[PDB]
Amino acid sequence: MIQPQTYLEVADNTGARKIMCIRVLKGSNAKYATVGDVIVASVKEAIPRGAVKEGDVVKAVVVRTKKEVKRPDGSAIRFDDNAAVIINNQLEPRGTRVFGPVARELREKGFMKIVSLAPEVL
Amino acid sequence: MRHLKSGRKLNRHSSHRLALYRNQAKSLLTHGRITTTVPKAKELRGFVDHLIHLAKRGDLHARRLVLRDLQDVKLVRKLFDEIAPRYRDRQGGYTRVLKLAERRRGDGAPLALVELVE
Amino acid sequence: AKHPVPKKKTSKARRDARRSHHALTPPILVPCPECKAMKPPHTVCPECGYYAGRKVLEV
Amino acid sequence: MNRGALIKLVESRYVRTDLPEFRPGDTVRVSYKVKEGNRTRIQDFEGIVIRIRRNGFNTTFTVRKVSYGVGVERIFPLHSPLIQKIDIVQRGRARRAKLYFIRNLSDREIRRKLRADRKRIDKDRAAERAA
Amino acid sequence: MKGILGVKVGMTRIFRDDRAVPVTVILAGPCPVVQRRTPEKDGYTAVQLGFLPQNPKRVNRPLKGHFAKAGVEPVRILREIRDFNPEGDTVTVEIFKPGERVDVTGTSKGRGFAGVMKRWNFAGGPDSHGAHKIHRHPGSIGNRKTPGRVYKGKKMAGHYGAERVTVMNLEVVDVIPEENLLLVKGAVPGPNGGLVIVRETKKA
RNA sequence: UAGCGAAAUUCCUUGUCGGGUAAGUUCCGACCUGCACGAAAAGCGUAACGACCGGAGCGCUGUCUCGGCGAGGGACCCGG
RNA sequence: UGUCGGCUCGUCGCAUCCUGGGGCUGAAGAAGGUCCCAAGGGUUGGGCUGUUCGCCCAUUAAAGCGGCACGCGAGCUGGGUUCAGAACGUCGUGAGACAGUUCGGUCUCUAUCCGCCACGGGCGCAGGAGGCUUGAGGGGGGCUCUUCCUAGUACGAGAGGACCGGAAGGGACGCACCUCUGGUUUCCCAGCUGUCCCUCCAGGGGCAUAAGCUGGGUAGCCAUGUGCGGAAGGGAUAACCGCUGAAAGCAUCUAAGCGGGAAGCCCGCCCCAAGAUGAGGCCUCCCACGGCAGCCGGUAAGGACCCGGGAAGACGACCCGGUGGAUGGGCCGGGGGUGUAAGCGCCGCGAGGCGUUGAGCCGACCGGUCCCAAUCGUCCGAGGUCU
Numbered sequence A: 001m002i003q004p005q006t007y008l009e010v011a012d013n014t015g016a017r018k019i020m021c022i023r024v025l026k027g028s029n030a031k032y033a034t035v036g037d038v039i040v041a042s043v044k045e046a047i048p049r050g051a052v053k054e055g056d057v058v059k060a061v062v063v064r065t066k067k068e069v070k071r072p073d074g075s076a077i078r079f080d081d082n083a084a085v086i087i088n089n090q091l092e093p094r095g096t097r098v099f100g101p102v103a104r105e106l107r108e109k110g111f112m113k114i115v116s117l118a119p120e121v122l
Numbered sequence B: 001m002r003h004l005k006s007g008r009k010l011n012r013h014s015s016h017r018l019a020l021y022r023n024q025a026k027s028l029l030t031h032g033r034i035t036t037t038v039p040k041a042k043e044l045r046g047f048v049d050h051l052i053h054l055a056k057r058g059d060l061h062a063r064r065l066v067l068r069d070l071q072d073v074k075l076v077r078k079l080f081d082e083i084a085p086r087y088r089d090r091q092g093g094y095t096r097v098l099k100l101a102e103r104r105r106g107d108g109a110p111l112a113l114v115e116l117v118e
Numbered sequence C: 001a002k003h004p005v006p007k008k009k010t011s012k013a014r015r016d017a018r019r020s021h022h023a024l025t026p027p028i029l030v031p032c033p034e035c036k037a038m039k040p041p042h043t044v045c046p047e048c049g050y051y052a053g054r055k056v057l058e059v
Numbered sequence D: 001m002n003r004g005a006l007i008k009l010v011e012s013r014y015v016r017t018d019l020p021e022f023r024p025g026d027t028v029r030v031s032y033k034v035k036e037g038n039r040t041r042i043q044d045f046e047g048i049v050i051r052i053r054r055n056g057f058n059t060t061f062t063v064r065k066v067s068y069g070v071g072v073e074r075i076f077p078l079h080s081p082l083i084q085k086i087d088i089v090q091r092g093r094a095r096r097a098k099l100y101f102i103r104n105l106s107d108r109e110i111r112r113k114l115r116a117d118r119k120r121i122d123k124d125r126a127a128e129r130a131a
Numbered sequence E: 001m002k003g004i005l006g007v008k009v010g011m012t013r014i015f016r017d018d019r020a021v022p023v024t025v026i027l028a029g030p031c032p033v034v035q036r037r038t039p040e041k042d043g044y045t046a047v048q049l050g051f052l053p054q055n056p057k058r059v060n061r062p063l064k065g066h067f068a069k070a071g072v073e074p075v076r077i078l079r080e081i082r083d084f085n086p087e088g089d090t091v092t093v094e095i096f097k098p099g100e101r102v103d104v105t106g107t108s109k110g111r112g113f114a115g116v117m118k119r120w121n122f123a124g125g126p127d128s129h130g131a132h133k134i135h136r137h138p139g140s141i142g143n144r145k146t147p148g149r150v151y152k153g154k155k156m157a158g159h160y161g162a163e164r165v166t167v168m169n170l171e172v173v174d175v176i177p178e179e180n181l182l183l184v185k186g187a188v189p190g191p192n193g194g195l196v197i198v199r200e201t202k203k204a
Numbered sequence F: 001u002a003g004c005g006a007a008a009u010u011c012c013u014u015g016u017c018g019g020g021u022a023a024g025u026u027c028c029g030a031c032c033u034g035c036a037c038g039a040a041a042a043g044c045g046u047a048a049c050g051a052c053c054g055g056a057g058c059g060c061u062g063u064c065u066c067g068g069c070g071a072g073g074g075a076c077c078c079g080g
Numbered sequence G: 001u002g003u004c005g006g007c008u009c010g011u012c013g014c015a016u017c018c019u020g021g022g023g024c025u026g027a028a029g030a031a032g033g034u035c036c037c038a039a040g041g042g043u044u045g046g047g048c049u050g051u052u053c054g055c056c057c058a059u060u061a062a063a064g065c066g067g068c069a070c071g072c073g074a075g076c077u078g079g080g081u082u083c084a085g086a087a088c089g090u091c092g093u094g095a096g097a098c099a100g101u102u103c104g105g106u107c108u109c110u111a112u113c114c115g116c117c118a119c120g121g122g123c124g125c126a127g128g129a130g131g132c133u134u135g136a137g138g139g140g141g142g143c144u145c146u147u148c149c150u151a152g153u154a155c156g157a158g159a160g161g162a163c164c165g166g167a168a169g170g171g172a173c174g175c176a177c178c179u180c181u182g183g184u185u186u187c188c189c190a191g192c193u194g195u196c197c198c199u200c201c202a203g204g205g206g207c208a209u210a211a212g213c214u215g216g217g218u219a220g221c222c223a224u225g226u227g228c229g230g231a232a233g234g235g236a237u238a239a240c241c242g243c244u245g246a247a248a249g250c251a252u253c254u255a256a257g258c259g260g261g262a263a264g265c266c267c268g269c270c271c272c273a274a275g276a277u278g279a280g281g282c283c284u285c286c287c288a289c290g291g292c293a294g295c296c297g298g299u300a301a302g303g304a305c306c307c308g309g310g311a312a313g314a315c316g317a318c319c320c321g322g323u324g325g326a327u328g329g330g331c332c333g334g335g336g337g338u339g340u341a342a343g344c345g346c347c348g349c350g351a352g353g354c355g356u357u358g359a360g361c362c363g364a365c366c367g368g369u370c371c372c373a374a375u376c377g378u379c380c381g382a383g384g385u386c387u
């Protein structure tokens, strides 16, 4: 359940470290964004000389949340951090790698390049 | 809403209600029959019946459990030696409550009597 | 709160019409099947001490 | 009528019994059936069970594991037809029923606070000897 | 337009095609007809149904004669299904088949005197910043001298619950003739053990 | 005059430039066209101090998204 | 007759921001421009500043304009402004002054009437009753986006890119629900500190909150969780488009007549509803009781009182039960929560550990069982007006 002001850990090699949600791209007035949702976010912390810098307004896609995500099979899944991955306007991952596991819902929502770059899809 | 919530509050907080049930259990297990208001009467039954059945069990664990609520060692000895045996074949219903005719003058409280079965 | 207050003195008609539901209902009594004394049902007879056909209380 | 009997009766067809018992603290490998694209495989989930809810057929248990530096929790229904098998890999002894606190402990402290349950391990070895 | 009386028994979920589907279990059948409403005798078409057998000692003479006219044992509940006419004299769960879409009607759980926030989902007030004793109050209710009154039907505080509620287009997950059971997918108004009516859906 | 200046003073005014912010009529740093600072009704600075008045951050939160449940004393019923 | 702005709560207008239906276009397509019809629903979150307004950020189908004492302080707020303090600029010899700036600065427990939300009591609906109903008339609801197939086709040099028709998936909103997810769970269980006590050890109780603190947690009530709704369809139309066709040999959508045509109107859907005094309909039950359209009295069908109670509930109402009985309490079984009780044995100098032992305890949930408590009863209650 990511909403505006929520801090996300970036799980790629774009140079960013923490972004902050500022909008959920999902209709005119969505309240929360879960796994597989594209958001607009302001970069709040980055390593030097990266692909992006602090203050950059980028679009990301959430890959794991601290809220649990319910699945039709009756089961659920929950992670220890709310994490996102920066993307471009063509849903492509801007970085070259992703770190940590990502959720399987992404495969349903057309993020095959992030799913392939994942070390483990859960 | 109160849907399926058991037990009364009796305009008392937790410790006050607990001590009320305890003191009435003591007074009853002593005198055999006490006069109380009808709600306190209808609520005593669970407490006293559970204690009496526990005394019917008879072992040391039951004596310590009952002594948690009763504290008085002599009263518990009386409950195990005199009161318990006369309910050896009775399964539950060790107490009874009968409504009294006339109310109370100061406040109009409807009274009742709670006594131990024969 | 700005202290609401009665606008007009209530007419005797209106106050008595409001009180139209104040009448007491008389008690509910039955004869005790031992001393035939009138007493509330489901209570122990306070004139003979009997209930359910046996002594319970000294009257 | 007995409404609880009716509920249990409707549930009866789906009740699963071939799954080995365990307690909060045991390390477990759950072989779960997973659809991805365009097939269905089996993905394993190995971790410490931190909680076991009990509601007859609606009993669900939660499993925690560190996966590549990220704490992951999965909740499974005991009578789910997607759990192919469950394998006990270690018996731990917990003084508690709910194991939430291990979300704030390091791995070392976790090993210190959930030591091996030598009793139920000896009971596991005591069986396992067929004739 | 088929229907049947029944009692909500409780909620659970089952597994169909690797999907956990929530169900309400309803004890519907059996229900015998005790009267039939015809256009020539009453003005419209309907079927009066009876549910749950009753101790005859608890039934009074008028209802007893009514039951007897149909040659039907005493029953606890009598409820009509309009625009219905089964050919037999007893309605069972067999009328509903898996996959059929239905509407279920029940009596909601009564919430008693309900605040404006529980009844009408009002926003209430601030819980700080000076808000003086109105953290749950409804606020303004009118204008001023114009119109100088309150609208009819203005959402306010009052009773809420224990009212007729109809939930529509619920899939029949399963039917169990041996136990007169009806497994529907979703939520059905009222507590476990409440009276519910199951009819065919009105939405194509 | 020195010093200071869109100021506890600047009408036009959210002046313009820079900083902070995803975005800053406030804030901080500048310029000076000071409507209408200015040197014991003191001028410009000042470590320490302030339940004084601004601005930003970290932490943490039912302040909020957005409300939910629970406790007790009233409110509700009866007697005075 | 409390004056800005906010918050809460709305409702209305339509000069329509969006969604819908159109005409003209300097309308190829896609996208716009302009005018016509349309008020059913919808119209976001944030930075600045008391602001309304406005600018800006990120979105959007869209971020409409207005009325209701510039809606709404016996609903809240009190930042602005508009008492007394203090200061700055400026004015005045001065006391003081400006609305010019700046810091601060008491907003009143009890609703009589109308109105509104809920809810009972009385009477009436010509005999009195138990049920089941019709729906006059009301309210609710009414939203929209993305992708895909059609089809990279019609159209265009190319970029770009459809009508019509057909699927799938969202956002907010509404109603219900507790299987799952997630809360609470005031004593359901365990751990821990300090002190006082029972009884010295052990084992326990009180108090540290109106749970002493911590770790958990049933039923219930709950959203963050789950199901479902917006329609489909029919009818009459608005702008607009026609058919046939005079007056007016032509022409004309019209003067006679007939089609097509909107998220709008009427029905359809859910809910209330015969106080609908126009008091409806159907099933069944009781009956011509005595004395003097009236009165008194005992009854009938029945109803109420009282009592055990209830996911019903402020009271009262509703619904269930009253020994011919499972309604509550107890007891037993199951679920469930807590997580291995006391005691004894064994190991250790000891704090403790092991075994007995998934033990002991254990509210509400699903059941069983007359052990206890609904004992015994009383009061109402038709004799059917007239053409």
Ligand SMILES: [Mg+2]
Pocket: A010, A011, A012, A099, A100
């Ligand atoms: Mg990472």
Ligand SMILES: [Mg+2]
Pocket: A054, A055
């Ligand atoms: Mg920077």
Ligand SMILES: [Mg+2]
Pocket: B001, B002, B003, E110, E111, E112
């Ligand atoms: Mg209630």
Ligand SMILES: [Mg+2]
Pocket: B001
């Ligand atoms: Mg409460």
Ligand SMILES: [Mg+2]
Pocket: none
């Ligand atoms: Mg109960």
Ligand SMILES: [Mg+2]
Pocket: B007, B017
């Ligand atoms: Mg209690």
Ligand SMILES: [Mg+2]
Pocket: B002, B005, B006, B007, B008
């Ligand atoms: Mg209670």
Ligand SMILES: [Mg+2]
Pocket: B008, B039
């Ligand atoms: Mg009570």
Ligand SMILES: [Mg+2]
Pocket: B011
């Ligand atoms: Mg009191």
Ligand SMILES: [Mg+2]
Pocket: B011, B012
């Ligand atoms: Mg008291």
Ligand SMILES: [Mg+2]
Pocket: B015
């Ligand atoms: Mg206390």
Ligand SMILES: [Mg+2]
Pocket: B015, B016
């Ligand atoms: Mg106390």
Ligand SMILES: [Mg+2]
Pocket: B046
């Ligand atoms: Mg008990």
Ligand SMILES: [Mg+2]
Pocket: B097, B098, B099, C042
């Ligand atoms: Mg009694």
Ligand SMILES: [Mg+2]
Pocket: B105, B106, B107
């Ligand atoms: Mg007195």
Ligand SMILES: [Mg+2]
Pocket: B101, B110, C040
């Ligand atoms: Mg009495």
